[PDB]
Amino acid sequence: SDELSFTINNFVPNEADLLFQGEASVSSTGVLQLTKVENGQPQKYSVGRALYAAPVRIWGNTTGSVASFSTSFTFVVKAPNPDITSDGLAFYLAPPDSQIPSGSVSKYLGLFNNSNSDSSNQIVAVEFDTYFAHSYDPWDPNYRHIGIDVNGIESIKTVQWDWINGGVAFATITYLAPNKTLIASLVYPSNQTTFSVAASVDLKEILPEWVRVGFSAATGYPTEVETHDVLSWSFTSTL
């Protein structure tokens, strides 16, 4: 594909154009629930991933060009016990066939097996990290944050994010190919607060020609559970 664009205003149960991994799924009410919820209550140690069914062409060696893209989606992270929550969700690009790694992966938002930034992971992600205690996440700044990750959970760049328990967030992620710059942005219309981050990233150097795009999220200790619900999602890429 040289141009791919899709808009999902309302998710549908077992949505055909979505590849589900782990405990992810969309509720009868139309929300993409990354982590498991029962009776409206988020469940402990849940890991989920949803990907758009069609692989996306990120670059062409025959062409020499690289894709520029932009994604926007709305989500809610509602926790019964706000004080300390875990772990957060993230939008990411990975190889078409990636699976959730085996092992302790909650503090890695379901994207990694460990802290390392292994070049083989081939993963570019934008995380919305809700857990930052150094006892379990020693690589995190001391506050909830939005970070840009490249082959590793230790964000190459972050910004402080003032999460609103149950607040509806509108986030857009944009990649300017010509400028190898990935920028992330989040807004809470309810508080009129904004957050943003940018980092240099050369997709040609990190990701393969084809990749699948989507979301990943994880839940940890029971007293810190929160939801990772996505309500809308639009994606556009142009090669």
Ligand X SMILES: CC(=O)N[C@H]1[C@H]([C@H](O)[C@H](O)CO)O[C@@](O[C@H]2[C@@H](O)[C@@H](CO)O[C@@H](O[C@H]3[C@H](O)[C@@H](O)[C@H](O)O[C@@H]3CO)[C@@H]2O)(C(=O)O)C[C@@H]1O
- Is residue 84 a contact partner of residue 220, using CB atoms and an 8 Å limit? no
Helix (H/G/I), strand (E/B), else coil: 167: coil
Q: Smallest gap, in angstroms, from Cβ of residue 134 to a copy of itself?
A: 25
Residue 137 engages ligand X in binding (rule: CB under 6 A): yes
Encode burial over 97-132: b for 16+ CB neighbours within 10 A, e otherwise: ebebeeeebbbbbbbbeeeeeeeebbbbbbbbbbbb
Residue 181 engages a copy of itself in binding (rule: CB under 8 A): yes
Q: Up-side HSE of residue 215: CA atoms within 13 Å toward CB?
A: 32
Structure token pair of residue 131: 């857990």
| List 131, 163, 195, 215, residue binding a copy of itself (CB under 8 A) | 195
Question: Binding string, 131-150, against Ca ion, x = CB under 5 A?
Answer: x-----x--x----------
Instruction: Give the CA diameter of the chain.
Output: 52
Residue 43 engages ligand NAG in binding (rule: CB under 6 A): no
Question: Under the rule (CB under 5 A), what is the footprint of Ca ion?
Answer: 129, 131, 137, 140
Question: Under the rule (CB under 8 A), what is the footprint of a copy of itself?
Answer: 157, 159, 170, 172, 174, 176, 179-181, 183, 185, 187, 189, 192-200
Question: Under the rule (CB under 6 A), what is the footprint of ligand NAG?
Answer: 61-62, 74, 101-103, 113-114, 168-170, 178-179, 189, 209
